[PDB]
Amino acid sequence: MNFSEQQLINWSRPVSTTEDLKCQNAITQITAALRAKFGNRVTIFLQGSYRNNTNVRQNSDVDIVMRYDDAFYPDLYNFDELKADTEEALRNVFTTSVERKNKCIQVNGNSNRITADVIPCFVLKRFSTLQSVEAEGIKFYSDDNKEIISFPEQHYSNGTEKTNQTYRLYKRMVRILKVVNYRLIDDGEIADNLVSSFFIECLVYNVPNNQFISGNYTQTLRNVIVKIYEDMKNNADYTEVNRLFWLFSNRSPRTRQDALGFMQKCWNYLGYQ
Ligand SMILES: [Mg+2]
Numbered sequence: 001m002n003f004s005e006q007q008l009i010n011w012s013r014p015v016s017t018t019e020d021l022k023c024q025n026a027i028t029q030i031t032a033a034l035r036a037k038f039g040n041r042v043t044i045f046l047q048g049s050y051r052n053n054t055n056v057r058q059n060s061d062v063d064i065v066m067r068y069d070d071a072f073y074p075d076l077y078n079f080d081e082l083k084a085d086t087e088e089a090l091r092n093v094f095t096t097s098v099e100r101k102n103k104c105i106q107v108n109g110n111s112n113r114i115t116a117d118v119i120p121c122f123v124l125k126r127f128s129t130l131q132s133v134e135a136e137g138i139k140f141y142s143d144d145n146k147e148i149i150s151f152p153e154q155h156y157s158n159g160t161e162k163t164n165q166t167y168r169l170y171k172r173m174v175r176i177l178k179v180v181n182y183r184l185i186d187d188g189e190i191a192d193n194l195v196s197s198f199f200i201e202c203l204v205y206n207v208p209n210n211q212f213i214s215g216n217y218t219q220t221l222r223n224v225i226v227k228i229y230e231d232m233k234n235n236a237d238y239t240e241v242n243r244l245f246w247l248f249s250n251r252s253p254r255t256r257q258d259a260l261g262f263m264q265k266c267w268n269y270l271g272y273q
Contacts, residue, residue, distance in 0.1 A: 001218065001270055001271040001272050001273065002269070002270055002271030003270060003271070005216075005217055005218050008176055008217040008218060008221060009217055011056070011175065011176045011179040011180075012172035012173070012175050012176050012217065013172075013175070014053050014054070014055055014056070014175065015055050015056050015057055015058055015060070016049075016050070016055035016057065016058060016059060016060040016114070017050065017053065017055065018046070018050050020114070021112075022059065022109070022112060022113050022114045023050060023062055023114050025112055025113040025114075026062055026064075026107070026109060026113040026114045026115070026116045027046075027062065027064065027116075029093070029094075029113060030064055030090070030107055030116050030118060031044055031064075032093075033089050033090050033092070033093040033094065034066055034086070034089055034090070034118070036089060036092075036093075037085060037086075037088070037089035038066070038068065038085075038089070040075055041068060041069070041070040041075075042066050042067055042068050042069065042070075043065075043066075043067045043069055043073065044064060044065065044066055044067075045064075045065050045067070045152075046062065046063060046064060046065065047063045047065050047119070047150065047152035047155075047156075048062070048063035048197070049063075049197060050062045050063065051063070051152065051156055052155070052156055052159055052160075052171070052201065053171060054171060054174050054175055054178065054197060054201065056175050056178045056179050056182070057182065059109075059114055060114065061109075061114060061115040061116065061117055062114055062115075062116045062117070063104075063116075063117050063119060064116050064117065064118050064119065065119045065121060065138065065152065066086060066118055066119065066120045066121070067121050067122065067123065067138055068082050068120065068121070068122055069122065069123050071123075072123045079120075079122070079140060079141045080141075082120050082122075083100075083105070083120050083140075086105055086118060086120040087100055087105050090105055090107055090118060094107050094108075097109075097110070100143075101117070101143075102142045102143045102144060103117075103119065103140070103142045103143075103148060104117040104118055104119045104120075105117070105118045105120070106118075119138075119140065120140060121138040121139060121140035122138065122139055122140065123136065123138065123139075124136065124137045124138050124139035124149050125137075126149065128244035128245065130239065130243065130244055130245065130246070131243065131244055135151060135154065135242075135244050136151075136153075137149060137150050137151035137152065137153070137154070137242075138150050138151075138152065151240075151242040151244055151245075154241075154242035154243065154244060155201075155240070155241045155242045158205070158241050158242060158243055159171065159201065159205065159241050162205060162209070162241075165209050166209050166212035167212060167213075167214040167215070169212040169213075169214075169217075169220050170204060170205070170212065172217070173204050173207075173212070173220060173221060173224050174200055174201050174204050176217075176221060177200050177204065177224075177266060178197060178200055180266050180269055180270065181195060181200065181262070183269065184265055184266075184269060189265060189269070190261075190262065190265055194258055194261065194262055195254075195258060195259070195262045196254075199247075199254055199258070199259070201241055202238060202239070202240050202241050202247045203228050203238065203247075203259055204224055204228070205238075205239070205240075205241045206228075206231070206236070206238040206239065206247070207223070207224050207227045207228065208227070211223040211224060211227055212224075221270070222272055225263050225266055225267050225270075225272070228259060228263050229260060229263040229264065229267070232256040232257070232259045232260035232263065233260065235256065236256075
């Protein structure tokens with residue numbers, strides 16, 4: 001195949017992490033700006049690639065969640081106002097670096113801090129039929145009126161558990177496939193939204209643990225791609241990493257065909273035979 005075992009190992013490593021000075025600087029500065037307005041009425045935490053340790057690009061943007069939750073976690077008002085107040089708190093400090101986006105407020109970085117997406121949100125509680133329990137996550141609204149929900153804590157914990165059980169290969173395989181995704185996008189071979197990082201993470205999550213072969217990145221990656229590809233042809237019922245909801249739920253526009261096509265492009269790019 002086209003890339004050596006060592007090249008796959010190199011691609012499997014995290015590139016940006018929460019240890020990075022520029023990441024710490026962004027979190028510190030943004031946290032101070034938000035606390036100046038909201039005090040203890042919010043919980044601030046990370047989600048996305050810095051939280052799950054799946055970054056494969058230098059100087060990656062960080063996703064900082066600001067959960068307005070005074071009603072649920074009190075000190076021992078609609079979403080439009082929350083997001084506007086969040087934007088104001090950030091603009092007072094970061095001025096022209098602040099840009100409102102559809103699902104977040106972006107705070108553009110500089111020589112000393114990474115860019116950050118600040119995600120104002122509320123507590124969400126929803127019943128999971130998969131687990132027959134009420135689950136707690138977050139909810140917010142996009143500027144184009146979609147209700148966006150997430151379970152970042154359960155996503156974090158389940159992904160960490162799987163990597164701990166697979167010789168650390170679960171997240172290493174996610175990272176490799178994210179690298180291939182960016183390369184295919186840069187080459188114009190796939191659209192930049194054929195698959196997202198979240199989608200890749202969920203696809204690999206559903207590959208059984210016994211497909212991850214200690215110390216064999218080439219064969220593990222082969223197993224991962226073949227398993228997802230075949231599962232997509234076979235109409236498989238994949239879960240999200242959070243194990244609370246189905247990946248191919250009728251709430252989500254992404255499809256098994258998207259995953260099948262992505263796996264094919266990865267297989268061809270990597271040169272497996
Ligand atoms: Mg992200």
